[PDB]
Design an enzyme around this catalytic site. Structure first.
Site, mmCIF file in Angstrom:
data_model
loop_
_atom_site.group_PDB
_atom_site.id
_atom_site.type_symbol
_atom_site.label_atom_id
_atom_site.label_comp_id
_atom_site.label_asym_id
_atom_site.label_seq_id
_atom_site.Cartn_x
_atom_site.Cartn_y
_atom_site.Cartn_z
ATOM 1 C CG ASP A 45 -6.746 30.798 -22.937
ATOM 2 O OD1 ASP A 45 -7.891 30.304 -22.921
ATOM 3 O OD2 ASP A 45 -5.901 30.506 -23.812
ATOM 4 C CG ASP A 185 -2.340 26.734 -26.338
ATOM 5 O OD1 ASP A 185 -2.554 26.849 -25.105
ATOM 6 O OD2 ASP A 185 -2.976 25.925 -27.041
HETATM 7 O O1 LIG Z 1 -7.430 26.090 -21.176
HETATM 8 C C1 LIG Z 1 -7.937 25.587 -22.401
HETATM 9 C C2 LIG Z 1 -6.943 25.859 -23.525
HETATM 10 O O2 LIG Z 1 -7.330 25.025 -24.637
HETATM 11 C C3 LIG Z 1 -6.322 25.023 -25.608
HETATM 12 O O3 LIG Z 1 -6.573 24.008 -26.497
HETATM 13 C C4 LIG Z 1 -6.329 26.412 -26.268
HETATM 14 O O4 LIG Z 1 -5.412 26.502 -27.340
HETATM 15 C C5 LIG Z 1 -5.920 27.464 -25.218
HETATM 16 O O5 LIG Z 1 -6.062 28.785 -25.720
HETATM 17 C C6 LIG Z 1 -6.796 27.337 -23.931
HETATM 18 O O6 LIG Z 1 -8.074 27.913 -24.120
#
Ligand SMILES: OC[C@H]1O[C@@H](O)[C@H](O)[C@@H](O)[C@H]1O
Ligand SMILES: O=C1CCCC2=C1C1(CCCCC1)N=C(Nc1nc3ccccc3o1)N2
Length: 391
Positions: A45, A185
């Protein structure tokens, strides 16, 4: 067995009763925002890549009322939330802005308030409840941010897009929780739809609702109930490593880079840097491939792609851990399982498993028996995004 997932009505009732006892009056507003699982498309992302999350029935609920004195008064009933369970503070001003501190759970609410784009925002009283395991890998914090945002809109409607709302919640995460997350998220918490996963193009911010409601198909979420400190400290390291690779190749982002281009410029990046980029480039591809497979109802291909995603995360991006790996290996040994992979940031948290619905009870028994630790399970349908209920 799988942990019960309280309906929004139950969490609402709990929050309402808590509010009534706390503030001596009935709440006027109620909102909810879900946690989520990412089916595939990890650490893409912030690389302007593709992600395919779905919203969970696990959610955060806020009930509350506007105040006339410009103060914010909060209470949470979540055990796991740090003390104190109550906090009051005046609204930020041009001369005085909110500041991150203790308790940490309030930092998410404070952050959203601070960066809320519309005015005048009044003060308010609110109670916070959640069924999302706090810091368990399913974006408890994103759900709190989005629930908070959704509440502030009722107090003072913004006039922007859903992506601007996600970015506000994201900025709160960055500046008040010290976690420089990507947009996934918050975006899925906002935009989830029951019975659908959400394909998010993180470059264009175009989104597509992909049907995911097949009785015979189930999504099993397994919590490792561990979280190494690297989940916090190594996350920003990964972002910097991706940026460095993109800069060395003269690319706006790794989304613009293909495996061939990467290998041709192998001499321009570090050994580990190459490993990071190879995952990212491959994971964007796999997510595109996964989206199409899910469309065809080809769960066997989707599952195979989930496995490639985990191996890539484990070996190239190196954000897995022995706990997650043992959970994945165990799940893949179970008949009826299409695929399994770590989900979210890594270094702990949850795995996500795609399997035949009938196989879910046998999957849970075997995964637990092979997990040298205590696993927690959720069986979740694709759920709605943020919602509002007038009380
Ligand atoms: O795919 C990994 C993910 O990790 C989460 O913890 C984060 O909040 C998201 O933005 C994304 O980067
Ligand atoms: O440990 C930190 C760092 C790792 C990520 C994790 C946090 C904690 C920080 C505050 C204490 C609990 C853990 N909070 C969650 N998010 C969260 N969502 C909530 C919804 C309702 C009430 C409270 C909530 O806390 N995320």
């Amino acid at each position: 067995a799988a942990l019960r997932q309280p309906q929004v009505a139950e969490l609402l009732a709990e929050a309402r009763r808590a509010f009534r006892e706390e503030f001596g009056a009935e709440p006027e507003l109620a909102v909810s925002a879900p946690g989520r699982v990412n089916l595939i498309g990890e650490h893409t992302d912030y690389n302007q890549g593709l992600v395919l999350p779905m919203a969970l029935e696990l959610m955060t609920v806020l009930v509350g009322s506007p105040r006339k004195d410009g103060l914010v008064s909060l209470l949470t009933t979540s055990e796991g939330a740090d003390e104190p369970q109550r906090l009051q503070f005046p609204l930020p001003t041009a001369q005085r802005s909110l500041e991150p501190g203790t308790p940490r759970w309030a930092n998410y609410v404070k952050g959203v308030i601070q960066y809320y784009p519309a005015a005048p925002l009044p003060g308010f009283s609110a109670v916070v409840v959640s069924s999302v395991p706090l810091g368990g890998g399913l974006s408890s914090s994103a759900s709190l941010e989005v629930a908070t945002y959704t509440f502030l809109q009722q107090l003072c409607p913004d006039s922007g897009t859903i992506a601007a709302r996600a970015q506000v919640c994201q900025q709160a995460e960055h500046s008040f929780a010290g976690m420089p997350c990507g947009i996934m998220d918050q975006f899925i918490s906002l935009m989830g739809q029951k019975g659908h996963a959400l394909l998010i193009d993180c470059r264009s911010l175009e989104t597509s609702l992909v049907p995911l409601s097949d009785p015979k198909l189930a999504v099993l979420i397994t919590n490792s109930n561990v979280r190494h400190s690297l989940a916090s400290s190594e996350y920003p390291v990964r972002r910097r490593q991706c940026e460095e690779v993109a800069r060395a190749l003269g690319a706006a982002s790794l989304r613009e880079v293909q495996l061939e281009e990467l290998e041709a410029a192998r001499d321009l990046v570090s050994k580990e840097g190459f490993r990071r980029a190879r995952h990212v480039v491959g994971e964007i591809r796999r997510t595109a491939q996964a989206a199409a497979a899910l469309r065809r109802g080809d769960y066997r291909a989707f599952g195979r792609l989930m496995v490639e995603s985990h191996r890539s995360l484990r070996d190239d991006y190196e954000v897995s851990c022995p706990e997650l790996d043992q959970l994945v290996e165990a799940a893949l040994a179970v008949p009826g399982v299409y695929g399994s992979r770590m989900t979210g940031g890594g270094f702990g948290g949850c795995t996500v498993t795609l399997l035949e619905a009938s196989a879910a009870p046998h999957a849970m028994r075997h995964i637990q028996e092979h997990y040298g630790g205590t696993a927690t399970f959720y069986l979740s349908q694709a759920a709605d995004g943020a919602k509002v209920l007038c009380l």
